[PDB]
Amino acid sequence: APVTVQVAVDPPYPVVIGTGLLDELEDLLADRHKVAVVHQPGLAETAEEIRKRLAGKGVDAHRIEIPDAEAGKDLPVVGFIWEVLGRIGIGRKDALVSLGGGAATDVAGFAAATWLRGVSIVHLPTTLLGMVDAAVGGKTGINTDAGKNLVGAFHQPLAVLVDLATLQTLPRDEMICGMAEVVKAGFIADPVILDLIEADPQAALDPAGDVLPELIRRAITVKAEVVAASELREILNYGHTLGHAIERRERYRWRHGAAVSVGLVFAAELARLAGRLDDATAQRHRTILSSLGLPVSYDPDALPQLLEIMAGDKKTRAGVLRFVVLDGLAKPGRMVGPDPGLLVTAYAGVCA
């Protein structure tokens, strides 16, 4: 019944896409002695239902509620999760289930990665961004005093269950910000994603339509294929060089997807001015993103503060900025240490 995308790492794991996946979760974890469901607050009820269905099969099943959103990835939260796994007596053969957006899958994933040096985790992402991106690929992380996105671990999930029923209650604004990673996947490796969205941009956002389920499958496949195929993975940062800087500048008060959207537009203008990307494919970034309702511009006077921010990013070595750029649709390449005047000119092409 559901579609499954296999992530061809070693060992491989499935990303299951379908409607009503609790049965598949039950049969998957039926034989574990203990399971802890780590969930964000608005999902207490789905978590309690998972817990009961599990306890029904004989699992000593627990739910662990963590703060919503970015508050949920903070070091004290993972400290709390560890203490709870201990109190419950979660062992090496036991399992965690994450239920929530990207922050939940990241913190629950980091906790599973480090508890007894690694226990199995199943991810149930409940946001579009979580489904196409954060839950696939095994990157986990937490927020510490050092900054965000710095501390983490690679830890592949036993499985990822992408339950489309859950999209029916997702607010429109979260749907739109999840679509920025789908669009990114389209530009880097699967232009059919772009063609499908262009047919009708508003049908792409409809959790009941037939387009969104296909876009999800395709975006997950692009990520699965990149991850299975050590630096090709950097292509997934497309739009994120400026995007992460904007987020930071706004103190994480902008949606991740909105910042990436502006970063994509910037990356396209950078490539266009460098002579690497044709005008048509370059312009297509702004037209697709703006048609979905995503921002395509940012504060015209922010470049100096953005440059200083990008200066300190982990990828920056000896003050040298690195960007993912396209040499054509689905032909990702790199631009290392671009001339400052070129960034200034690209930024003006985006903001003015």
> In the range 234-253, which residues lie near Cl ion by CB under 5 A?
none
Quick check: 16 binds Cl ion (CB under 5 A)? no
- 56: Cβ contacts below 8 Å, ≥ 6 apart: 26
Binding-site residues: 68-73, 102-106, 126-127, 139, 148, 166-169, 181, 240, 256
Q: Determine the 3-state secondary structure of 13 from DSSP.
A: strand
Give the total of residues touching Zn ion (CB under 5 A): 4
Could you please report the per-residue DSSP string of 127-171?
SHHIIIIITSS-EEEEEETTEEEEEEEE---SEEEEEGGGGGGS-
* Cβ 183 vs Cβ 197: under 8 Å: yes
Residue 24's identity, in one-letter code, is E
Q: Which of 14, 72, 102, 137 binds Zn ion (CB under 5 A)?
A: 102
R_g of the chain computed on alpha carbons: 20
User: Which residue's CB comes closest to Cl ion?
Assistant: 101
Residue with tokens 């007894």: 116
Quick check: 101 binds Cl ion (CB under 5 A)? yes
- 319: Cβ contacts below 8 Å, ≥ 6 apart: 311
Q: State which residue, 69 or 211, has the beta carbon closest to Cl ion.
A: 69
Q: State which residue, 24 or 74, has the beta carbon closest to Cl ion.
A: 74
- HSE on the CB side for 288, CA within 13 Å? 28
Quick check: 295 binds Zn ion (CB under 5 A)? no
Q: State which residue, 42 or 56, has the beta carbon closest to Cl ion.
A: 42
Quick check: 129 binds Zn ion (CB under 5 A)? yes
What the block records as the tokens of 203 is: 């049908």
Q: Which stretch binds Zn ion (CB under 5 A): 50-58, 94-102, 261-269, 298-306?
A: 94-102
Quick check: 222 binds Zn ion (CB under 5 A)? no
Q: Which of 43, 50, 59, 103 binds Cl ion (CB under 5 A)?
A: 103
> What is the binding site for Zn ion (CB under 5 A)?
101-102, 127, 129
> What is the binding site for Cl ion (CB under 5 A)?
69, 101, 103
